[PDB]
Design a protein around this ligand. Structure first.
Ligand SMILES: O=C(O)[C@H]1CN(CCCP(=O)(O)O)CCN1
Ligand SMILES: O=C(O)[C@H]1CN(CCCP(=O)(O)O)CCN1
Ligand SMILES: [Mg+2]
Lengths: 236, 334, 97, 338, 51
């Protein structure tokens, strides 16, 4: 399992684009109104008022020259109140946007370019399996390029494969579904995860071996189906 | 009634039945005609109340930074101002420097007069960076502290000042129970003043009492522990709350009524004890005696602020105003 | 009330004990006329069924063993009611759930 | 398929695909058909060709911001208190300066908010301390407002969705949750046969639909709250249309098989063919061609964005202030002339 | 956990039981002892003792 960082554009998440455009238009309108009202050494100019408003919006850090008008002072005070409210809202939204959880790559499973075309990608995916088994023969019969690629990642031993995966020496472990699930259910922490049950290759099941033509097969199958229907399977 | 018994107890006594399985309460008077097995569930006299928000924190504004940190910051600011004034003199008064530092700490909210030089400018920049860091940390800690939970009133099982002398509280406690029952008789027999006070509230019906509690016309409902617990878990939300099982009054249990000398009492007692030990009792309670809100945890609520929440800050402002007036009066002479 | 039992030297130094159980015992004695002589369990354990190094012979220990042997006539302490202990001794109605 | 009474006689018989197969009108059932005990006592099922379980559909409504106005953190009482306190402080500062004017009001306004126009600083020691305390109080007020807004925004999340079949909201039916089904399928039999599920079965009996498509369409609308059809179909529907999601975990594991009569000379051959197809990889190819493909993936619920609800109030006040200034400019000019 | 300030009893109650007075079988005190316990529970002596 991975961790996941914050998006590069998260600094614009708190406000929608329409909000930014509306704020810009409101600032322009306010500057024009203040310039018009100022009519009724340091000559006042529209550019100076726009610069003052822009500086006072974020944190009024930049040096500005206040207007000499009366109503201009009230307009500047109202704009400052709006700017403080906007800054507080933006900071609160940004703080709320920094809470991010973990995620899983959600591999399709033996059907994506990761296990088929690793060369045309980032450094090649390091996926391996325990050699000398039925899974290896199934992969060889069904695929050739994948088997050749995996031949260089023969992780001997389930515990050894898990240790290699934890330390980063391997990127994926291909094995039996039940064993992998059981191991994932007992590993230290929660670093290791297993793919979804709906994306399993060559699905099969565990059964009971009986005689070739024994008459108990039907009874055993019916009993197993009854156990499944009752709900004791989930409890077990 | 009129000497003879009635109901399940009467039927068992009359010999037409051997056992009475159900929600039967065990009491001393009822045990003189029949034999009761070990109770399979506990019960008593319990009180149901309503949850309170409780998100006020007058001193929360001082939580982010401890007093030692504030004093250290003040001493560091004084030392920095003194060093800056000395450096400026070596190359405008101390009061101006301290005023400038104070304004810088509070986001330069006042038009201070900047000094002239290079070392002074460097020191001012360093202090500005420190003030920015301090303000960011304070705001973050205050935001973290703003998260508040929901608490439940602490009642010591019908032995609180609110139940013995409700008249002391200006909003007198309003506790009620259904009359013409065992709970009212027990309360009257045990306590006299409490019964007289509660007589004014005689809500009839469990549903009526629950509706009154939800609306707010009542403060507490006294009833059977098991019934109250069952009703609490089947409420629209989690407003209704029952006190802990360790504070119930007149503890008792539900048992199985058997004839005086039957010979099955030992067997049934052993069977019930085996059921308790094995663990089927917990499964039965979860399956039957458990609601949606029965296992619900205390939620996290973010309430807004009001006048009482802002307590202390206004007190600090008033104290500062009084100190300023006192200093003006004192210095007016010399 | 005087309270005879071992300490830590296997001497039975008599201390004085009191509390909830002592108050309940005093109330019971007042209700029904009978004297009492309280003492502590030498083993110091509530009681359980265990085996022995010799042949398999069932035997209790602690308060249960003392009561079964006959050194005591009644047990006044925080003793839970369970099926295992209910097959040999008799419990009264619970005084604390 | 499901066993039910005809309502006319005392003889019960199967209906649907099971009834048609038993009636002899068909020799096989090539379609999604879960293997269960009830249907296994009459017909023969081949080895499963698709393992699946049961899931629940959810509408997954897009999150929205609960904030309505910028005055939410502070009640009107606090606003009035601060408005009066600023004037009181300005008057006190003016009196202190005079004993030992609009300048005091300008300074108070510029210290409270960040106007930057409140020029002129007090020179008396008492006035200096009062100004410092006022600045500290304003900073504390702003910090508290920001912290409360951040806390409210962080704790503003949509209601939790259903998680599995053990959710208490499902175990206690109400008049809001529906979670209907197809009304004749393996799901209905499973829910009816369950011992400690009578309440859920009774609640679902009055809302069961007639087909999976109708139930999915109702869920897409506001008429249905949950769907418990299956997993192989619900997952495909969610993948194709990201307007819906699948919640919970599988709680009834089963598989799809080929239905045939008890005396049919095809069971063994069909089972061997299914096993060979599973082993070689034909089933994988079929799944990739028909199932293993999506249009829009899913994304963990992220924090909402301040929509024009934030604009409401703030820009209304800005417009009101502009109107007041335009109205008062003439009065100010007339007063200056007079 | 009431006079330490550093210990907490966290969790739910399981294996609910009660404290009783143990005696030998066939003792002429069981009925009277149980009746006394019930009378104490009803009157309020147990509440006073707990307080
Ligand atoms: O077939 C069996 O009898 C056992 C053997 N399986 C081991 C599979 C070994 P590989 O993954 O093919 O290399 C485990 C459960 N089934
Ligand atoms: O005594 C019993 O057998 C029943 C009756 N109880 C009703 C109690 C009525 P009130 O609260 O005392 O007025 C409920 C369970 N025990
Ligand atoms: Mg500023």
């Amino acid at each position: 399992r991975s961790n996941g960082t914050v998006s590069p554009s998260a600094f614009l998440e708190p406000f929608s684009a329409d909000v930014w455009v509306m704020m810009f238009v409101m600032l322009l309108i306010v500057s024009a109104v203040a310039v018009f009202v100022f009519e009724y050494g340091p000559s006042f100019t529209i550019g100076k008022a726009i610069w003052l408003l822009w500086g006072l919006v974020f944190n009024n850090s930049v040096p500005v020259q206040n207007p000499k008008g009366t109503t201009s002072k009230i307009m500047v005070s109202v704009w400052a109140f709006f700017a403080v409210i906007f800054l507080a809202s933006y900071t609160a939204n940004l703080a709320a946007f920094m809470i991010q959880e973990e995620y899983v790559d959600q591999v399709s499973g033996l059907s994506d370019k990761k296990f088929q075309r690793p060369n045309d990608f980032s450094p090649p995916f390091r996926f391996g399996t325990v050699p000398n088994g039925s899974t290896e023969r199934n992969i060889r019969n069904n695929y050739a390029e994948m088997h050749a690629y995996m031949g260089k990642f023969n992780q001997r031993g389930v515990d050894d494969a898990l240790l290699s995966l934890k330390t980063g020496k391997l990127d994926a472990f291909i094995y039996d579904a039940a064993v992998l699930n059981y191991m994932a259910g007992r590993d230290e922490g929660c670093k290791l995860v297993t793919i979804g049950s709906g994306k399993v290759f060559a699905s099969t099941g565990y059964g009971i071996a009986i005689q070739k033509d024994s008459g108990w097969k039907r009874q055993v199958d019916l009993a197993i189906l009854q156990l499944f229907g009752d709900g004791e399977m989930e409890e077990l | 009634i009129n000497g003879t018994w009635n109901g399940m107890i009467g039927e068992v006594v009359m010999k037409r039945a051997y056992m009475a399985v159900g929600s039967l309460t065990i009491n001393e008077e009822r045990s003189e005609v029949v034999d009761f097995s070990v109770p399979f569930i506990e019960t008593g006299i319990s009180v149901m109340v309503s949850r309170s928000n409780g998100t006020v924190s007058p001193s929360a504004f001082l939580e982010p930074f401890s007093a030692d940190v504030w004093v250290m910051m003040f001493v560091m600011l004084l030392i920095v101002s003194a060093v800056a004034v000395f450096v400026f003199e070596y190359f405008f008064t101390i009061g101006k420097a301290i005023w400038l530092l104070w304004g810088l700490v509070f986001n330069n909210s006042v038009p201070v007069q900047n000094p002239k030089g290079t070392t002074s400018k460097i020191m001012v920049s360093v202090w500005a960076f420190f003030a920015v860091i301090f303000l960011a940390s304070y705001t973050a800690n205050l935001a973290a502290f703003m998260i508040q939970e929901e608490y439940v009133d602490q009642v010591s099982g019908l032995s609180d000042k609110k139940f013995q002398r409700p008249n002391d509280f200006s909003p007198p406690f309003r506790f009620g129970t259904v009359p013409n029952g065992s709970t009212e008789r027990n309360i009257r027999n045990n306590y006299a003043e409490m019964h007289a006070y509660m007589g004014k509230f005689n809500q009839r019906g469990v549903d009526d009492a629950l509706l009154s509690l939800k609306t707010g016309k009542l403060d507490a409902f006294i009833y059977d522990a098991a019934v109250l617990n069952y009703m609490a878990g089947r409420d629209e939300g989690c407003k209704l709350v029952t006190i802990g099982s360790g504070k119930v009054f007149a503890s008792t249990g539900y048992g199985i009524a058997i004839q005086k000398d039957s010979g099955w009492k030992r067997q049934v007692d052993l069977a019930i004890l085996q059921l308790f030990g094995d663990g089927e009792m917990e499964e039965l309670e979860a399956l039957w005696l458990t609601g949606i809100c029965h296992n619900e945890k205390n939620e996290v609520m973010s309430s807004q602020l009001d006048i009482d929440n802002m307590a202390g800050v206004f007190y600090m402002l008033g104290a500062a105003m009084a100190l300023s007036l006192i200093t003006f009066i004192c210095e007016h002479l010399f | 009330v005087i309270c005879t039992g071992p300490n830590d030297p296997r001497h039975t130094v008599p201390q004085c004990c009191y509390g909830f159980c002592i108050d309940l015992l005093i109330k019971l004695a007042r209700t029904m006329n009978f004297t009492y002589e309280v003492h502590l369990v030498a083993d110091g354990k509530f009681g359980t069924q265990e085996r022995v190094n010799n042949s398999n012979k069932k035997e209790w220990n602690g308060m249960m063993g003392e009561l079964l042997s006959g050194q005591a006539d009644m047990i006044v302490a925080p003793l839970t009611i369970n099926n295992e202990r209910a097959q040999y001794i008799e419990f009264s109605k619970p005084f604390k759930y | 398929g499901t066993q039910e009474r005809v309502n006319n006689s005392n003889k019960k018989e199967w209906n649907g695909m099971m009834g048609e197969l038993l009636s002899g009108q068909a020799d096989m059932i090539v379609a999604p058909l879960t293997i269960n005990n009830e249907r296994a006592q009459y017909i023969e099922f081949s080895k499963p060709f698709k393992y699946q379980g049961l899931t629940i559909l959810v509408k997954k409504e897009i999150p929205r911001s609960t904030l309505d106005s910028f005055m939410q953190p502070f009640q009107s009482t606090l606003w009035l208190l601060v408005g009066l306190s600023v004037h009181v402080v300005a008057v006190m500062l003016y009196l202190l300066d005079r004993f030992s004017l609009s300048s005091a009001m300008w300074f108070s306004w510029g210290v409270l908010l960040n106007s930057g126009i409140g020029e002129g600083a007090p020179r008396s020691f008492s006035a200096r301390i009062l100004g410092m305390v006022w600045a500290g109080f304003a900073m504390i007020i702003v910090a508290s407002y920001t912290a409360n807004l951040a806390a409210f925004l962080v704790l503003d999340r949509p209601e939790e969705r259903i998680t599995g079949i053990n959710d208490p909201r499902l175990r206690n039916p109400s008049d809001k949750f529906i979670y209907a089904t197809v009304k004749q399928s393996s799901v209905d039999i499973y829910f009816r046969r369950q011992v400690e599920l009578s309440t859920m079965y009774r609640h679902m009996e009055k809302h069961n639909y007639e087909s999976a498509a109708e139930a999915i369409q109702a869920v897409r609308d506001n008429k249905l709250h949950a769907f418990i059809w299956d997993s192989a179909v619900l997952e495909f529907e969610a993948s194709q249309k990201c307007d819906l999601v699948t919640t919970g975990e599988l709680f009834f594991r089963s598989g799809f098989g080929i239905g045939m009569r008890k005396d049919s000379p095809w069971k063994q051959n069909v089972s061997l063919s299914i096993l060979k197809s599973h082993e070689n990889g034909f089933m994988e190819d079929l799944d990739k061609t028909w199932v293993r493909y999506q249009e829009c993936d899913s994304r963990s619920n992220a924090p909402a964005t301040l929509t024009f609800e934030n604009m409401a109030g703030v820009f209304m006040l800005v417009a009101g202030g502009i109107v007041a200034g335009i109205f008062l400019i003439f009065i100010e000019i007339a007063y200056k002339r007079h």
